[model samples]
Target: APAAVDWRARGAVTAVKDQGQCGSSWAFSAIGNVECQWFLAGHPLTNLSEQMLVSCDKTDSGCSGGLMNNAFEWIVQENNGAVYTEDSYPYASGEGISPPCTTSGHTVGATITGHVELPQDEAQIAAWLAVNGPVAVAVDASSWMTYTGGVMTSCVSEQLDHGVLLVGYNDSAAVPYWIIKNSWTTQWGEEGYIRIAKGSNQCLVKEEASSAVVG
Candidate 1:
């Protein structure tokens, strides 16, 4: 028998961003993706701030960057909660700093809201997507040439520095498309979205989760 699948229910989804410096792309991608999911679901989560991860998440290898799994571990093991607001927990940009490229906040306990993590280079991503909703991926957003809106078909990344979420993927299209959310303003990059080639969308680090609710 063939494998099972679930069709997607399309609709307008909110886009978000993260300041990319010190390779903390994972922080923004993970938190933003999860937040978008919750907000769309009508539950409205407690704005899990990215700076909490930006400031305390150490696995981030400084600018070259981090993975969602590492960020999750920090939240789980480090007993640190994601701050409540971007204004309070702004992004850390332009690398090269000592003892915190961003502001410092009190460490508060946190829980897994609810999410799914996958192994490196796993095709199970499709399976995961079938069951879960939007997912944060670390794809080869490399050649994502300073895009400025609506269905990205062009790219040019000598090296990948950014991160985004995979809301959906489709091969049935004229050109295979991987539905992605952007951090750049909604005015930029496909209305703050991109549809990279499926094969081209590859994750660099170890683990990236299909984020879910947490407290």
Candidate 2:
């Protein structure tokens, strides 16, 4: 595996987003992974709709809580692999209220066949990411509210409560860390990014790492 990788430098990442009061970080993570995968597949980097999943994926509890894997499955199996453009569906759950899903009149921006879960090992996940792209991860973000910047080493690994994207890693740094993109907006750490201790499973990031598959 490579010692370091950062997809952001390759323009595979979209702009940072804000989930607002909605417990829709799940949607943002899933969509972020999909957007990057689609772009890496030789398409232009386009923002897919987090609202599309938040409102449409019935298996997930919109605005309350949800899973990234469920959002991937919902796009492939239920929606025929069609992901509408963000400009079309647009996010509307910022206030923690999920308006009913809109069924049509939107333009499709990307599509995915499915998703894959990486091993529970940080090294392995980093290897996959160095070769593929970003990965969606579940984390115990309970301590994140007070986080400002820099590499985080004291995060709790218990009780996963948020979804995020792992966009890069640096094993050569003094403190090896994984670069994570958060949905809390650019006003937060590192302009909407966070670096957590990689090998130590900080915040349980290695427990559930997955990504969308696109062609």
Candidate 3:
């Protein structure tokens, strides 16, 4: 395994974004991976459109809920939507209803060849982030609704209900946790972020981990 790594500290993450109450965390999760992977691939930071996925991507549900892998597949394989910039598409949903899918907007900001699914092991996931960029993950998050800070350890559940970005990890702490980015805005939990305890599949974070491969 590699040393502890924090992608945010290395300038590989974008500003925290909010998904509001739309249950569109999956879109934000996919955006985080695509943005980070583009930067890691020797390109400047590009704010891809989460609204594109929220409105255009038909592989997953719009605001009710969705899957990370489905979003990646729609971007890279099926739709090849090319993805627009935040300024072009802008997030219009999340408050309760999803607006009509926009046909004309910003040009294609970036593209991903595909995505790679990482093994469900904390050490392996950490090492992958150390080499790759941020990874999209789905977690139980049954108790994350009330998270306030510190390392989370009591939120584990078999029923995964939320999606988030696994940006990096810090294995040096007493609890040893993974640095996660949430889509509930900066007003919630550590500036829209949370640290989940490593090992024991805390919150089943390791259950679904994958990263996009940008061109």
Candidate 4:
């Protein structure tokens, strides 16, 4: 692994998304990882629907909250690995209210066989990410509401409540930081991305790290 890696630069990441007033970051995190994995697996990069998971994954509470792991399982065991495209299903839960789960007339953009959680160590996670791709991760986003830019050195310690994606890292940077993609829209934080101090586990970035497996 090198001192720095950016999956976005490699064209494996989708644009930043907006979960809106809905607490559906988990769906974006899961679907985002699948989008990258699907790209790395020789498929064209496409925007998958987070709304599908937000509404269809019965194991997870729609717009209320969710676990990335449960979302993956539901995609595999329940949805038969078919993930819908954004335009076909579209996001209908942005207003903080999720419509009934709709399973018809949607376009499948990608399919994931399974998912795996990565090591909790930042170094290891970065190593794997350098070679693999962007990773799905949970963090304590309580302090993110006021972020402006630069590598965040400190934040509200643990209590991981928000799911996000890790797009890259620079271990040799002056401050050493992990680049994270958020679901709060391009209007938020560094064009919808944040750089947190790496290795120190800023925002608990190393915890609950995972990614989907494309086959």
* Best-to-worst lDDT order: 2, 4, 3, 1
Q: Candidate 1: deviation at residue 62, Å?
A: 5.4
Give lDDT tens digits, candidate 4, residues 52-171.
998889899989999999999999999999999999999998789999888788999999999888999998898889888999999999999999999889888679999999999998
Quote each prediction's TM-score: 0.67, 0.99, 0.96, 0.98
lDDT head-to-head 1 vs 4, winner = 4
Residue 67 lDDT, candidate 1, scale 0-100: 71
61-174: candidate 2 lDDT, tens digit per residue = 999999999999999999999999999999988889988989878899999999999999988898899999999999999999999888999897789999999999999999
Deviating ranges (above 4 Å) for candidate 3:
none
Report lDDT (Cα) of residue 144, candidate 2: 95
TM-score result, candidate 2: 0.99
> Per-residue lDDT for 1-215 in model 1, tens only?
11322122444244356353445667767776656555556554435666666666776664456776566666555544343455565554534342464444543222454456665443566556555556777655665656554445545534445666776767666766666776655665766667665445333422444565554
> Candidates' lDDT values, in order?
0.56, 0.94, 0.86, 0.92
Off by over 4 Å in 1: 1-14, 18-22, 37-42, 61-64, 80-83, 92-115, 119-123, 146-161, 199-215
Off by over 4 Å in 2: none
Off by over 4 Å in 4: none
Root-mean-square deviation of candidate 2? 0.6
Tens digits of per-residue lDDT for model 3, 1-215: 66588889878899999887797989999988999999898888888899989887888889988998899899877657387788888888868578867776467888888889999888888888888878899999888879999999867568878889998888788988888999888988999899988886888999899988886
lDDT of 1: 0.56
Candidate 4 at residue 192, lDDT? Answer: 96
